[PDB]
């Protein structure tokens, strides 16, 4: 058979009859308006289908058109700069086609439009008659100035080439490759369809070593993240959340940036959809938009709840598709707490047993099966490239408490936790990344790369963290006892800790010279702030009062190192060399 | 002896909801039977029969029902229960969660086929564990000493270094003054957790006897049920049928029971506390009580299962039910981990029930049973005193309780804190323990009688 009939609708669920050769978790199209559903139980000849849209006006006898596929994404050119929802309907194309301000709920508009033509080029030694396996880079499509959309083979099939396309412009419906297998030659276009719940196959997993240069100084030095890693941040109303998200898109070492807004809000989603197309990227040449390497999954709370459950899996599948080309993908999911509310709605719909505070039994399993899709990993194929997927997943716990069935399940899986604080945003301490509760499990991996590339860095981090923990312990006794009873070796730690909290940790994102400091500057300012701290140890154990008044120009040199403008690149290292020896003069005095 | 009738193949599925497939018109179905599902695209899935009623048989596939058709799928009934191929060359290799090789290797040649559920040991022919395992850690060997054949879990949480102290007690496991075959079940672990255990066993050269079973988080949750079952029926083979001392490490046991809750909630079974099934005590005890040693054999099996308690709660259904089956636990804490103690082992909720028979004159020496009770009592009083100086003041305490302050800062830094590769002997541990009792007077050591105070306290 090819159609089924409805035989009854009792809410979101449609128990469709005449469905004998249908599979589980397969997508159908219910009714005359073709409402998208999902087969969820299959009782012999009848299948019950939960429908993603509003079942209203559905008759008994309406055609249930089965697709034979599960919830899958269309992967191909036309995906950078596009805006989808959780089930991948192009929201920018659906407003031009219909000229309306709503989503008409009967719209099967394709995710990649078949009208735009793309310049395809073959793989140039991919001859006719050559054997090819799944994951091989088959062609290259110049989608933008930045993104070379490498057409690949799907990992399911395999064969020998019988026809390749000549280099030119083609649609996403044109036949580009024919492959001969034992039985029948298969042909397919530039677009491949892959299910969102199924992890992309890959050759072998690799440990992550290269760090993510986020650009912020507290993130790149104290609590570093690697490309191929898992990060979590608190998702509160205002601490630094949109600031860290836009700095990750603007000034990271990552080739594409996807952003999954997952069931967010009414007007917080429109803040993202208006500000991201007007951001700017600093390429070697002239300034370009950030939207040439960006793909958004925009999903509000008004949208279907089974699209908000699938918005996380839609994003990570787009993350794994651009991973397979050889790029370094970084994924920002905001937030994973609103996604877990969608799991509680689907489980509450099917009357599933509530395991932990309402949330179903498989909450910790779906979170484990999502963060494990991120990693630096060698892709399938013969050209032998390497890619990565980083995941920064926001967590929005109730009341800012970190004891929650979603929060505690997240912090047991993620390795980096940049703890953004509300009270630090009250004092305008920007960025608001707290350093007491934050951590990073990615130090050892990083420790390899920092002895091939920076060398004198690690011990610098260890003592700088030793200063900040000893500062908080000392600051308790300042109000109880007083600063006049404190020892001479301790009070020099307190002033340099205040020097770290203003020069190193505080970083103004609007002050031009501070938008994207690269690395040596980060090793630069800390090499002078702790050598000053180490030289002050023997200078005290040889008077703290005479050094504080006489170093007021030398301390002003340390308090002004953050103004090394980007017209000063090699010169900044020379000023870092000369400002150190001015400290070396005044040590003997 | 051997099943020689050809297996039947049914295309007669009648219902599929959740992980359960309902097959109709089966002729004489069998409980706990294993089956093989052939999908309409050709991928093969296995499954156990969890309920049979007349002609109907309810199976559950291990890899999930995503894509199982009604007209085109074909299930083939293997006529026996789930038996794994076990061998002596099932050692030195790494396997997945279900049954299959990982390191580009062959399938095992199957010296015999053992049922993975096993069968319980007769308590009349089960000899009590007596000899002590020296693990090289003072918090383990000194206060909560384990025996060879003892089940004892590591009670941990998320983020604490439980994997680091798991690899430490594997390198340093030895008899108190012919190696331990380690079988390792990795369940629901991260990739960096599985790479840590792989690169540690491939570092110390013990990988000629490691039986590592890895089951990552991307692998399905129903295969986590049979993962300790296969990891303990090879250890049963190596110890009761091949005469070899086996150390079994189960991690994570929280990932076992969270996977056990998903299958129970899908079968609509009766829940206990926090959604976990009512038969969770029985299912935890059918993989815990498969340990110890028997009378006619010279091999043994000891179990150290690692579990992370949710939200640091020892009254959660995971560490409470494993505390009722096992023989004492090891409690790695969080508040001692912030102070950069490498084993953050709070010894107050730690216990070893078989430690009494493993200490004494013939086992280590005379003062082991007495210094461990005194180090426990001075740590218990001094920690209650620590909750008094934080609420009243650091100066207005009893003069004896300032020695309890000086004991605790020397207990947590010198006795338990030893480093990732230092392996103290049991005689080194009691010698360090008497140094911390030296700061107390002779008549405040109440739990030690006056006889052995004369031989050890003046030194």
């Amino acid at each position: 058979s090819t159609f089924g009939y409805v035989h009854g609708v009792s809410g979101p669920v449609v128990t469709a009859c005449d469905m004998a050769g249908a599979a589980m978790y397969e997508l159908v199209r219910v009714g005359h308006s073709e409402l998208v559903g999902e087969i969820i139980r299959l009782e012999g000849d009848m299948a019950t289908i939960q429908v993603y849209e509003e079942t209203s006006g559905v008759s008994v006898g309406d055609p249930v058109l089965r697709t034979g596929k599960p919830l899958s994404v269309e992967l191909g050119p036309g995906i950078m700069g596009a805006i989808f929802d959780g089930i991948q309907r192009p929201l920018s194309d659906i407003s031009s086609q219909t000229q309306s301000i709503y989503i008409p709920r009967g719209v099967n508009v394709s995710a990649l439009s078949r009208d735009v033509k793309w310049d395809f080029t073959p793989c140039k030694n991919l001859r006719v008659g050559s054997h090819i396996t799944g994951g091989d880079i088959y062609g290259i499509v110049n989608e933008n100035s930045l993104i070379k959309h490498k057409i690949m083979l799907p990992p399911r099939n395999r064969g020998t080439v019988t026809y390749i396309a000549p280099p030119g412009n083609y649609d996403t419906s044109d036949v580009v490759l024919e492959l001969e297998f034992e039985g029948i030659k298969e042909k397919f276009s530039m677009v491949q369809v892959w299910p969102v719940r199924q992890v992309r196959p890959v050759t072998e997993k690799l440990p992550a070593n290269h760090p993510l240069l986020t650009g912020q100084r507290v993130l790149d030095a104290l609590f570093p993240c690697v490309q191929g890693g898992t990060t979590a941040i608190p998702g509160a109303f205002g601490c630094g959340k949109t600031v860290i998200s836009q700095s990750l898109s603007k000034y990271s070492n990552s080739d594409v940036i996807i952003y999954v807004g997952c069931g967010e809000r009414g007007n917080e989603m429109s803040e993202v959809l208006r500000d991201f197309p007007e951001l700017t990227m600093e390429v070697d040449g002239k300034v370009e938009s950030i939207m040439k390497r960006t793909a958004l999954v925009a999903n509000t709370s008004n949208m279907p709840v089974a699209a908000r459950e699938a918005s996380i899996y839609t994003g990570i599948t787009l993350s794994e598709y651009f991973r397979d080309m050889g790029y370094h993908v970084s994924m920002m999911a905001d937030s994973t707490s609103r996604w877990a509310e969608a799991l509680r709605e689907i489980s509450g719909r099917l009357a599933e047993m509530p395991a932990d505070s309402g949330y179903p039994a498989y909450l910790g399993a779906r979170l484990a099966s999502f963060y494990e899709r991120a990693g630096r990993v060698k892709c399938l194929g013969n050209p032998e490239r390497e890619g990565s997927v980083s995941i920064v997943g926001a967590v929005s716990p109730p009341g800012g408490d970190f004891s929650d069935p979603v929060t505690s399940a997240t912090l047991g899986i993620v390795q980096v936790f940049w703890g953004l604080d509300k009270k630090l945003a009250q004092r305008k301490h920007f960025p608001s990344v707290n350093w007491l509760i934050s951590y990073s499990k990615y130090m050892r991996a990083l420790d390899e790369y920092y002895d091939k590339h920076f060398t004198e860095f690690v011990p610098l981090r260890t003592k700088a963290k030793e200063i900040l923990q000893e500062e908080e312990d000392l600051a308790e006794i300042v109000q109880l006892v007083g600063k006049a009873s404190l020892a001479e070796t301790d009070k020099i730690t307190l002033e340099v800790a205040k020097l770290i909290k203003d020069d190193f940790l505080q970083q103004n994102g609007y002050t031009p010279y501070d938008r994207f400091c690269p690395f040596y500057k980060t090793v630069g300012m800390l090499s002078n702030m702790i050598a000053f701290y180490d030289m002050a140890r023997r200078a005290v154990e040889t008077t703290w009062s005479i050094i504080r008044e006489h170093m007021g120009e030398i301390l002003y040199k340390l308090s002004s190192m953050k103004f090394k403008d980007p017209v000063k690149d090699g010169e900044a290292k020379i000023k870092a060399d000369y400002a150190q020896l001015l400290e070396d003069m005044q040590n003997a005095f | 002896n051997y099943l020689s009738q050809p297996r039947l193949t049914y295309k007669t599925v009648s219902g599929v909801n959740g992980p359960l497939v309902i097959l109709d018109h089966v002729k004489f179905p069998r409980y706990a039977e294993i089956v093989h599902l052939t999908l309409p695209d050709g991928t093969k899935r296995s499954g156990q029969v969890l309920e049979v009623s007349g002609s109907k048989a309810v199976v559950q596939v291990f890899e999930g029902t995503s894509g199982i058709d009604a007209k085109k799928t074909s299930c083939e009934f293997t006529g026996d229960i789930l038996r794994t191929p076990v061998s002596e060359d099932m050692l030195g290799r790494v396997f997945n969660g279900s049954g299959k090789p990982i390191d580009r290797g062959p399938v095992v040649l199957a010296e015999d086929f053992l049922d993975i559920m096993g069968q319980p040991i007769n308590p009349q022919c089960r000899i009590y564990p007596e000899e002590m395992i020296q693990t090289g850690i003072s918090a383990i060997d000194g206060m909560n000493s384990i025996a060879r054949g003892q089940k004892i879990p590591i009670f941990s949480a998320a983020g604490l270094p439980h994997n680091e102290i798991a690899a430490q007690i594997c390198r340093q496991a030895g008899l108190v003054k012919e190696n331990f075959a380690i079988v390792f079940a990795a369940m629901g672990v991260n990739m960096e957790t599985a790479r840590f255990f792989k690169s540690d066993f491939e570092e110390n050269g013990s990988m000629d006897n490691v039986c590592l079973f890895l089951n990552l988080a991307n692998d399905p949750t129903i295969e986590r049920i049979i993962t300790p079952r296969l990891a303990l029926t090879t250890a049963e083979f190596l110890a009761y049928q091949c005469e070899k001392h086996v150390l079994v490490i189960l991690t994570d046991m929280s990932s076992y029971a969270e996977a056990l809750r998903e299958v129970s909630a899908a079968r609509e079974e009766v829940p206990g506390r926090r959604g976990f099934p009512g038969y969770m005590y029985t299912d935890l005890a059918t993989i815990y009580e498969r340990a110890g040693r028997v009378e006619g054999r010279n091999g043994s099996i000891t179990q150290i299962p690692i579990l992370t308690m949710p939200n640091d709660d020892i009254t959660h259904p995971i560490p409470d039910l494993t505390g009722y089956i096992t023989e004492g636990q090891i409690y790695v804490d969080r508040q001692l981990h912030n102070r950069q103690i490498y084993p953050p082992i709070n010894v107050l909720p730690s216990l070893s029930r078989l430690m009494k028979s493993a200490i004494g004159e013939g086992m280590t020496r005379k003062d082991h049973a007495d210094v461990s009770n005194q180090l426990y009592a001075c740590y218990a009083i001094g920690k209650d005193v620590q909750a008094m100086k934080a609420v009243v003041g650091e100066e207005a305490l009893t003069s004896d309780d300032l020695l309890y302050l000086e004991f605790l800062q020397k207990f947590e830094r010198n006795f338990i804190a030893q480093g990732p590769y230092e392996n103290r002997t049991v005689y080194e541990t009691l010698d360090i323990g008497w140094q911390l009792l030296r700061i107390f007077p002779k008549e405040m050591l109440k739990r030690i009688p006056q006889s052995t105070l004369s031989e050890f306290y003046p030194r």
Binding site: A351, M353, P354 | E268, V270, P271
Partner: peptide, 18 residues
């Protein structure tokens, strides 16, 4: 929740035969 779902499961059993 377990008691009320068990009543609804038994209510479909009597409805199916009758």
């Amino acid at each position: 929740f377990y008691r009320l779902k068990k009543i609804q499961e038994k209510k479909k059993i009597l409805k199916e035969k009758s």
